[PDB]
Amino acid sequence: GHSYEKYNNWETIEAWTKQVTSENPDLISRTAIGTTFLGNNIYLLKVGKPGPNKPAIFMDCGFHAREWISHAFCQWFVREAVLTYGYESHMTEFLNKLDFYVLPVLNIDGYIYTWTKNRMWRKTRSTNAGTTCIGTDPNRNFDAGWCTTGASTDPCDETYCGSAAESEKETKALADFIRNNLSSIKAYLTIHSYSQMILYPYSYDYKLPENNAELNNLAKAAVKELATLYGTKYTYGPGATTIYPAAGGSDDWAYDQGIKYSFTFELRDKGRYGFILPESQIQATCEETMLAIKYVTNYVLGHL
Ligand SMILES: CC(C)[C@H](NC(=O)[C@H](Cc1ccc(O)cc1)NC(=O)OCc1ccccc1)P(=O)(O)O[C@H](C(=O)O)c1cccc(NC(=N)N)c1
Ligand SMILES: [Zn+2]
Question: Which residues hold substrate?
Fold first, then answer.
C-alpha cells in the first residue's frame, strides 16, 4: 500500500515506480542506472512529454538514508507532474519543453536500513576493508575537492568520504549518468533535510561561483515563492558560509561539470523534529517545495 502522505518502504517505492510508469507511459519512462552495493535497483524516472533532443533538469532524493521527507518529495513531484499535465499551464509547458530526470532514491541500501534497524542511519551500507564499520557518506564521495574538508577519512565516521571519489556504486552510477547526458542537463537539484535552506556552490571551498549573483537572486526568489503558500521561512546562500564547509558534494561536482544551476534543498524542519518529520507534515512540506522547484524550472527554461 503506497501513500503519498506516508513514508513508504523501498519495496513499496519500487512497486510504485513500476505502477506509476505503467499507468502514465505517455509521461513517464523508467530505467535503472545501476545497482546498489546490496543489489537493489537504482531507478530513474524520465518525466516529460516524450520528444527528440529535449533539454533536462536532474533531480535526486534519498542521498541520505534518514532524511525521509526527501524520498517523499520525489514521489510527490511525480504525481503532481502526471496529474496536472494538460491543465496547469506551467507544468504543461515544462513537460512539453524539457524532461525531469527524477531519481527517487539514490541510497536505497541505507534507506532500507533505516526501516529495518537504525532510523538515524545516514551512509551507504558498503563494507570497508580492515574494519567492521559500514558505509560511506555519498555526499562526501564526489570529485569536488574530494575529502579535503568537512569530511572524515575514517570508515567508522558519519562523513566518511570513501576510499576515493566515486568509490560507491551508487555515486559512480549517478556521476556516470550525468556525465553521459551533460549536453542536455541544464540544472541539478538534490533534495535533503533538514534546515529549510536552498544552498548553491561552493561548499568544498570559500570561493564563489562565477554566476553567484544570479544564483543568489534565483535562490532568493525561490524561497520567497515557497513562503507564499504556508509562510515557511527558508534561508539561502553558498554552502560553505551558509551552513558549513564540506568537500565531495554532488552539487559542487555537478556545477564544476558545467551545470550552471545547481542547488541543494534542505526541507523542513529547523530541528524540532529534525529527520523524524511527522507524516502529518509531508503534504504541506511537499506542496511548498513544489512551488520553489517549479519556480526554478520556469527560470531555467526561460534562460536556455
Ligand atoms: C541536517 C542536514 C544539514 C544534514 N546534515 C547532517 O546530517 C550532519 C552531517 C554531519 C555529521 C557529522 C559531522 O561531524 C559533520 C556533519 N549532521 C548533523 O547532525 O547536522 C545537524 C545540523 C542541523 C542544522 C544545521 C547544521 C547542522 P545533510 O543533508 O547531510 O547536509 C548536507 C551534507 O552535509 O552533505 C549538505 C547541506 C548543505 C550543502 C551541501 N552541499 C555540499 N556540497 N556540502 C550538503
Ligand atoms: Zn542530507
Answer: 64-67, 122, 139-140, 193-194, 244
For the domain spanning 1-304, the CATH number is 3.40.630.10
How far apart are alpha carbons 41 and 182 in whole angstroms?
Answer: 23
The amino acid at 123: K
Strand partners, 41: 35
DSSP character at residue 39: S
Distance 55 CA to ligand 1 centre (A): 31
- Sorted by sequence, the CB contacts under 8 Å of residue 53 that are 6+ apart come out as 184
Q: Which residues are annotated as a binding site for substrate?
A: 64-67, 122, 139-140, 193-194, 244
Cell numbers that stand for 231 in this block: 509562510
Q: Solved how?
A: X-ray
Give the CA distances from residue 39 to residues 175, 187, 265, in Å, rounded to whole numbers and listed in that order. 18, 29, 28
Burial level of 137, CB count in 10 A (0-12/13-18/19+)? Answer: buried
Q: What is the 3-state secondary structure (H, E, C) of 224-265?
A: HHHHHHHCCCCEEEEHHHHCCCCCCCHHHHHHHCCCCEEEEE
DSSP per-residue codes, 161-201: --SSTT-SHHHHHHHHHHHHTTTTEEEEEEEEESSSEEEES
> What's this structure's resolution in Å?
1.7
Residue nearest to atom 27 of ligand 1 (CA): 243
**Known catalytic residue at 266:** yes
Q: What angle do CA 24, 97, 229 make, to 5 degrees?
A: 75
d(CA 243, CA 220): 16
Domain ranges of the chain: 1-304
